[PDB]
Structures are given as C-alpha cells and as structure tokens.
C-alpha cells in the first residue's frame, strides 16, 4: 500500500443528513499528508443552508487514512485500500442529543472518496447545539482496540461554549476494512481538530486536523 497511499493525497466528501429533522447536504474537498497525520478540508453547504445548528457536530465526520502511525502499530485503515473501509459512529451528548453516522471510504482515480450519512436527534431546542453556542472541540484522545474482526474506538469529547463552559459527549466508532487486513493491538490516537476559517453563516467552512497514534497516555 506504499504505492496506493501516496505521501500527498486528496479526497472528496459528500455528506447528507438531518439534525432535529432539518435536512441538509454538504460537499467538500480536502488534501493532506497521510503519513504525517495532517489534513485540511474545505466544505460547502449545498442544501439546507444556512444550517440552524452548530457546525461542530459535523466537523468530526469529514478521515482515518490520515493518522500518523509508528512502524510497530499496524495501520489497519491505510492497509484497507484500495478497496477501503466503512465506519459507524454514535455520539451521545450530555443533554440527551444524539448523532449517529455511517461512512464509506474508497479510493478512485488516485483520490479518496468519502460518503457520509448523519442523523442528529433529541437536541434540546434551548441547548448549545440548536442555539449555535459551541466554539470548537478540545484536543482529544481516541482509545482504539480490535474486537470481532473490526477496529473500535471510544473517546470522551468536549466542546467549548461561548459562555466559557463546556458541553461533553461520548463517542463510539467501529471501523471495518472491506478486506481482511491486519488489526492492531490497543493504542491511542491523539487528535486536534480546528475550524481555521468560516463565513458568517457557516455555509463555507475550512478545517485542519492533526492525528497521531501512540502507545503513551501522557500529556
């Protein structure tokens, strides 16, 4: 896969979804350095905008092939190409909001192709997601482990809020390659996800993410 997954790779992403019944679509394009763990994405809301909820609940869904791994941790999701992988995610927020997400990743004509479906439900009409009071995710760590022939990841996540407080969530994701490839043992993936620019109504957004696998739990 050293020649399938190049040191510089682009991707295209399509998301369709709904949040508290508001339907929307997003199209975007991104690029990054899969072995250095860095990537940027430029997203455009193409249906349903301006969105009546916080961009932040969407931002984690736009790319696991771009995680830097040490040589002694098998890079299962890079190894899955060119066929690729699928993932399924549950995000439970502390005020009862829920987002469930499914995603398919493939490689076509030398670019990654991502297709995302998202359903957000049960967010309080008063809460920070529907009132657009969130201000980005704090840096986080996803604990990974193999189970039942797939790679699972779990994390505790936290959104900063305009009022200086925080809004917490738990994330559970299952990642499954489309062909048997080697699973890793347990390890941690440290992630930093930033919104680097956006227009006034978040119908045009750019993101940057850095992700790296480690054995260490330090900081």
CSV table of C-alpha atoms in Angstrom, one decimal:
chain,number,residue,atom,x,y,z
A,1,UNK,CA,0.0,0.0,0.0
A,2,UNK,CA,3.1,2.2,0.0
A,3,UNK,CA,2.3,3.0,-3.7
A,4,UNK,CA,-1.6,3.1,-3.2
A,5,UNK,CA,-1.4,5.6,-0.4
A,6,UNK,CA,0.9,8.4,-1.5
A,7,UNK,CA,2.6,10.9,0.7
A,8,UNK,CA,0.2,13.6,-0.6
A,9,UNK,CA,-3.4,12.6,-1.2
A,10,UNK,CA,-6.6,14.5,-2.0
A,11,UNK,CA,-10.2,13.5,-1.0
A,12,UNK,CA,-13.8,14.4,-1.9
A,13,UNK,CA,-16.6,14.1,0.6
A,14,UNK,CA,-20.4,14.1,0.3
A,15,UNK,CA,-22.5,14.3,3.5
A,16,UNK,CA,-26.3,14.0,3.6
A,17,UNK,CA,-28.0,14.3,6.9
A,18,UNK,CA,-30.6,15.7,9.2
A,19,UNK,CA,-30.4,17.3,12.6
A,20,UNK,CA,-33.7,17.6,14.6
A,21,UNK,CA,-35.4,17.0,11.3
A,22,UNK,CA,-33.6,19.7,9.4
A,23,UNK,CA,-32.3,18.1,6.2
A,24,UNK,CA,-29.1,19.2,4.6
A,25,UNK,CA,-26.2,18.2,2.3
A,26,UNK,CA,-22.5,19.2,2.2
A,27,UNK,CA,-19.9,18.7,-0.5
A,28,UNK,CA,-16.2,19.2,0.2
A,29,UNK,CA,-12.7,18.5,-0.9
A,30,UNK,CA,-9.6,18.1,1.1
A,31,UNK,CA,-5.9,17.2,0.9
A,32,UNK,CA,-3.2,16.1,3.3
A,33,UNK,CA,-0.1,14.0,4.1
A,34,UNK,CA,-1.4,10.6,5.3
A,35,UNK,CA,1.9,9.5,6.9
A,36,UNK,CA,2.4,12.9,8.7
A,37,UNK,CA,-1.1,12.8,10.1
A,38,UNK,CA,-2.2,16.2,8.8
A,39,UNK,CA,-5.0,17.3,6.5
A,40,UNK,CA,-7.2,20.2,5.6
A,41,UNK,CA,-10.8,20.3,4.2
A,42,UNK,CA,-12.9,22.9,2.6
A,43,UNK,CA,-16.6,22.2,3.0
A,44,UNK,CA,-19.6,23.9,1.3
A,45,UNK,CA,-23.2,23.5,2.5
A,46,UNK,CA,-25.1,22.7,-0.7
A,47,UNK,CA,-28.7,22.0,0.5
A,48,UNK,CA,-30.5,23.1,3.7
A,49,UNK,CA,-28.3,26.1,4.4
A,50,UNK,CA,-27.7,28.2,6.4
A,51,UNK,CA,-27.8,25.3,9.0
A,52,UNK,CA,-29.9,26.0,12.1
A,53,UNK,CA,-27.4,24.1,14.4
A,54,UNK,CA,-23.7,24.1,15.4
A,55,UNK,CA,-21.2,23.2,12.7
A,56,UNK,CA,-19.2,21.5,15.4
A,57,UNK,CA,-21.3,18.4,15.5
A,58,UNK,CA,-20.5,17.8,11.8
A,59,UNK,CA,-16.8,18.6,11.9
A,60,UNK,CA,-15.5,15.2,13.2
A,61,UNK,CA,-17.1,13.4,10.3
A,62,UNK,CA,-15.2,14.8,7.5
A,63,UNK,CA,-10.8,10.7,7.6
A,64,UNK,CA,-8.8,7.9,9.3
A,65,UNK,CA,-6.4,7.2,6.5
A,66,UNK,CA,-4.5,10.4,7.6
A,67,UNK,CA,-3.4,9.2,11.0
A,68,UNK,CA,0.3,9.1,11.6
A,69,UNK,CA,1.3,5.6,12.9
A,70,UNK,CA,4.6,4.3,14.3
A,71,UNK,CA,6.0,1.3,12.5
A,72,UNK,CA,5.1,-1.1,15.3
A,73,UNK,CA,1.3,-0.3,15.2
A,74,UNK,CA,-0.4,-1.8,12.1
A,75,UNK,CA,-2.1,0.9,10.1
A,76,UNK,CA,-5.3,-1.1,9.5
A,77,UNK,CA,-7.2,1.7,7.7
A,78,UNK,CA,-4.4,2.5,5.3
A,79,UNK,CA,-3.9,-1.2,4.7
A,80,UNK,CA,-7.6,-1.5,3.7
A,81,UNK,CA,-7.0,0.4,0.4
A,82,UNK,CA,-7.7,0.4,-2.4
A,83,UNK,CA,-11.0,-1.2,-1.5
A,84,UNK,CA,-11.3,0.9,1.6
A,85,UNK,CA,-13.4,0.7,4.7
A,86,UNK,CA,-16.7,1.7,6.4
A,87,UNK,CA,-17.4,3.1,9.8
A,88,UNK,CA,-20.4,3.6,12.1
A,89,UNK,CA,-20.4,6.1,15.0
A,90,UNK,CA,-22.6,7.0,17.9
A,91,UNK,CA,-22.1,10.4,19.7
A,92,UNK,CA,-24.1,10.8,22.9
A,93,UNK,CA,-24.2,14.3,24.3
A,94,UNK,CA,-24.7,15.1,28.0
A,95,UNK,CA,-28.1,16.9,27.4
A,96,UNK,CA,-29.6,13.9,25.5
A,97,UNK,CA,-28.6,15.0,22.0
A,98,UNK,CA,-27.6,12.0,19.8
A,99,UNK,CA,-25.8,11.8,16.5
A,100,UNK,CA,-25.4,8.6,14.5
A,101,UNK,CA,-23.2,8.5,11.5
A,102,UNK,CA,-22.3,6.0,8.8
A,103,UNK,CA,-19.5,6.4,6.3
A,104,UNK,CA,-17.9,4.6,3.3
A,105,UNK,CA,-14.3,5.3,2.2
A,106,UNK,CA,-12.9,4.2,-1.1
A,107,UNK,CA,-10.1,5.2,-3.5
A,108,UNK,CA,-10.9,6.2,-7.0
A,109,UNK,CA,-8.6,7.7,-9.7
A,110,UNK,CA,-6.0,8.3,-7.0
A,111,UNK,CA,-8.2,10.3,-4.7
A,112,UNK,CA,-10.1,9.2,-1.6
A,113,UNK,CA,-13.9,9.3,-1.9
A,114,UNK,CA,-15.9,9.7,1.3
A,115,UNK,CA,-19.7,9.3,1.6
A,116,UNK,CA,-21.3,10.2,4.9
A,117,UNK,CA,-24.8,9.8,6.3
A,118,UNK,CA,-25.7,11.6,9.5
A,119,UNK,CA,-28.7,11.7,11.8
A,120,UNK,CA,-28.9,14.1,14.8
A,121,UNK,CA,-31.9,13.8,17.1
A,122,UNK,CA,-33.2,14.8,20.5
A,123,UNK,CA,-31.2,18.0,20.8
A,124,UNK,CA,-33.0,20.4,23.2
A,125,UNK,CA,-34.3,23.4,21.3
A,126,UNK,CA,-32.7,25.5,24.1
A,127,UNK,CA,-29.4,23.8,24.1
A,128,UNK,CA,-26.0,24.9,22.7
A,129,UNK,CA,-26.2,22.9,19.5
A,130,UNK,CA,-29.5,24.3,18.3
A,131,UNK,CA,-28.6,27.7,19.7
A,132,UNK,CA,-25.2,27.7,18.0
A,133,UNK,CA,-23.2,28.4,21.2
A,134,UNK,CA,-20.3,26.0,20.6
A,135,UNK,CA,-16.8,27.1,19.9
A,136,UNK,CA,-14.8,24.0,18.8
A,137,UNK,CA,-13.6,20.7,20.3
A,138,UNK,CA,-10.8,20.5,22.8
A,139,UNK,CA,-7.9,18.2,21.8
A,140,UNK,CA,-8.9,14.6,22.4
A,141,UNK,CA,-7.6,11.1,22.5
A,142,UNK,CA,-9.5,8.1,21.0
A,143,UNK,CA,-8.7,4.7,22.7
A,144,UNK,CA,-8.6,2.0,20.0
A,145,UNK,CA,-8.9,-1.8,20.3
A,146,UNK,CA,-9.6,-4.7,18.0
A,147,UNK,CA,-12.9,-6.6,18.5
A,148,UNK,CA,-14.9,-9.1,16.4
A,149,UNK,CA,-12.7,-8.5,13.3
A,150,UNK,CA,-13.0,-4.7,13.3
A,151,UNK,CA,-11.2,-1.8,14.9
A,152,UNK,CA,-13.2,0.0,17.6
A,153,UNK,CA,-12.5,3.4,19.1
A,154,UNK,CA,-14.0,5.2,22.1
A,155,UNK,CA,-13.5,8.7,23.4
A,156,UNK,CA,-14.7,11.3,25.8
A,157,UNK,CA,-15.1,14.6,23.9
A,158,UNK,CA,-15.7,18.2,25.0
A,159,UNK,CA,-17.0,21.3,23.1
A,160,UNK,CA,-16.1,24.7,24.4
A,161,UNK,CA,-19.0,27.1,24.7
A,162,UNK,CA,-19.4,30.9,24.1
A,163,UNK,CA,-20.3,31.3,27.8
A,164,UNK,CA,-16.9,29.9,29.0
A,165,UNK,CA,-18.4,26.5,29.9
A,166,UNK,CA,-18.2,23.1,28.2
A,167,UNK,CA,-20.5,20.6,26.7
A,168,UNK,CA,-19.5,16.9,26.8
A,169,UNK,CA,-20.1,13.9,24.6
A,170,UNK,CA,-19.0,10.2,24.4
A,171,UNK,CA,-18.1,8.8,21.0
A,172,UNK,CA,-18.2,5.2,20.0
A,173,UNK,CA,-17.0,4.2,16.5
A,174,UNK,CA,-16.5,0.9,14.7
A,175,UNK,CA,-14.2,0.9,11.7
A,176,UNK,CA,-14.2,-2.2,9.3
A,177,UNK,CA,-12.0,-2.8,6.4
A,178,UNK,CA,-13.6,-4.2,3.2
A,179,UNK,CA,-11.0,-7.0,3.1
A,180,UNK,CA,-9.2,-8.8,5.9
A,181,UNK,CA,-6.1,-6.9,6.8
A,182,UNK,CA,-4.0,-6.8,9.9
A,183,UNK,CA,-5.6,-5.3,13.1
A,184,UNK,CA,-3.5,-3.5,15.7
A,185,UNK,CA,-3.5,-4.1,19.4
A,186,UNK,CA,-4.9,-1.4,21.7
A,187,UNK,CA,-3.4,2.1,21.3
A,188,UNK,CA,-4.4,5.8,21.5
A,189,UNK,CA,-4.9,8.3,18.7
A,190,UNK,CA,-4.4,12.0,19.8
A,191,UNK,CA,-6.4,14.4,17.7
A,192,UNK,CA,-6.6,18.1,17.3
A,193,UNK,CA,-9.4,19.4,15.1
A,194,UNK,CA,-9.6,23.1,14.3
A,195,UNK,CA,-12.0,25.3,12.3
A,196,UNK,CA,-9.5,27.5,10.5
A,197,UNK,CA,-11.9,29.8,8.7
A,198,UNK,CA,-15.6,30.2,8.0
A,199,UNK,CA,-18.1,32.6,6.6
A,200,UNK,CA,-20.7,34.4,8.7
A,201,UNK,CA,-23.4,31.7,8.4
A,202,UNK,CA,-21.0,28.7,8.3
A,203,UNK,CA,-22.1,27.8,4.8
A,204,UNK,CA,-18.4,27.8,3.8
A,205,UNK,CA,-16.0,26.2,6.3
A,206,UNK,CA,-12.3,25.1,6.4
A,207,UNK,CA,-10.9,22.6,8.9
A,208,UNK,CA,-7.5,21.4,9.8
A,209,UNK,CA,-6.8,18.1,11.7
A,210,UNK,CA,-3.7,16.6,13.1
A,211,UNK,CA,-3.9,12.9,14.3
A,212,UNK,CA,-1.2,10.5,15.6
A,213,UNK,CA,-1.3,7.1,17.1
A,214,UNK,CA,0.8,6.4,20.2
A,215,UNK,CA,1.1,3.8,22.9
A,216,UNK,CA,1.5,6.6,25.5
A,217,UNK,CA,-1.4,8.1,27.5
A,218,UNK,CA,0.7,11.1,28.6
A,219,UNK,CA,0.3,14.9,28.4
